Design a protein around this ligand. Structure first.
Ligand code: OGA
Ligand code: MG
Ligand code: NI
Ligand code: ZN
Length: 331
């Protein structure tokens, strides 16, 4: 069995290997990369996403989100308070202000320590989930707006044509902006490209051990767990590496830098934080190996998770027994 300890693997494809996206994902899986839940892909030196980032300041962040924490430093939830619209140039200035800028630090490990010590005492503002793309249309390799769609994959594997679309999203971050513990909708893959700026630290639980994280989360968030049998779908709970280690939960960590891709694999729980002002692009995708995970994915039906239009067909076709309850939660 390849990668039996479920370590995060780092790949360096050549320019020839960077042509065929599906083939390279399957290659990484042949080497056991999915066992970690997360892999890093460093593009060949010949590749670029676009020519420059000099002209992005007028992008609008219609609904910036202030991430307010409750709990203790290692075990907390966050809610998202909506703020007034601002441009990416305005948001960048805000991120660099004395109130929000990254503190002085020695290295990524010192900054990680500072994040976990101090996160709860601040409320950073995240420009998340903005439909759009920063890949140039002429970039033919690993262009996150030109991937094969999940609807086409379902149709190819199962024969059923469905409605829905699959487009990328932009994330503008600052110091301490946080992504809560989650797997993707319908336990899909994700791919995330860090276009510019400061790093993103990731934590990940191997898919084979996801239920250990879920059991811990029910213990640590007992009100939330009574409210919903899949409350991590709400994407609000944080648990620190120290707390995971104290509770014996298998996990790994890695820091993504600008110019690097990360892939999350089906049912790979992940969480993390941004080091300072940055911009990422991410999208969900599927492969044949996903279908079995999609059929078994948990679902939130309490009303909180509320998701895209395109998840309807995935539930309806893959999970017909659950569909009526799930759809009630959507309405
Ligand atoms: O970058 C972020 O805030 C969160 N991204 C992801 O969870 C992802 O790419 O799957
Ligand atoms: Mg612009
Ligand atoms: Ni994710
Ligand atoms: Zn729920």
């Amino acid at each position: 069995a390849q990668n039996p300890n479920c370590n995060i693997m780092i790949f360096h494809p050549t320019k020839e290997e960077f042509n065929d996206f599906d083939k390279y994902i399957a290659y990484m899986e042949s080497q056991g990369a999915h066992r970690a839940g997360l892999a890093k892909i460093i593009p060949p030196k010949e590749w670029k996403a676009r020519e420059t980032y000099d002209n992005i300041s007028e992008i609008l962040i219609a609904t910036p989100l202030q991430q307010v924490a409750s709990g203790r430093a290692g075990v907390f939830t966050q809610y998202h308070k909506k703020k007034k619209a601002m441009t990416v140039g305005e948001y960048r200035h805000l991120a660099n202000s004395k109130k929000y800028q990254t503190p002085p630090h020695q290295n990524f490990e010192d900054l990680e320590r500072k994040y976990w010590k101090n996160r709860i005492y601040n409320s950073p503002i995240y420009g998340a989930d903005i439909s759009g793309s920063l890949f140039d249309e002429n970039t033919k390799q690993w262009n996150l707006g030109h991937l094969g769609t999940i609807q086409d994959l379902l149709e190819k594997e199962c024969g059923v044509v469905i409605e829905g679309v699959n487009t990328p999203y932009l994330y503008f971050g600052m110091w301490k902006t946080t992504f809560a513990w989650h797997t993707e909708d319908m336990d899909l893959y994700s791919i995330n490209y860090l276009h510019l700026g400061e790093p993103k630290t990731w934590y990940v639980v191997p898919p084979e051990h996801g239920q250990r994280l879920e059991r811990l989360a029910r213990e640590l968030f007992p009100g939330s767990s009574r409210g919903c049998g899949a409350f991590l779908r709400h994407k609000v709970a944080l648990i620190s590496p120290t707390v995971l280690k104290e509770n014996g939960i298998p996990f790994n960590r890695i820091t993504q830098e600008a110019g690097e891709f990360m892939v999350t694999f089906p049912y790979g729980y992940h969480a993390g934080f941004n080091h300072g002002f940055n911009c990422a692009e991410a999208i969900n995708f599927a492969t044949p190996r996903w279908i079995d995970y999609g059929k078994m994915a948990s679902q939130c039906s309490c009303g909180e998770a509320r998701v895209t239009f395109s998840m309807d067909a995935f539930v309806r076709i893959l999970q017909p027994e659950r569909y009526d309850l799930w759809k009630r939660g959507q309405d």
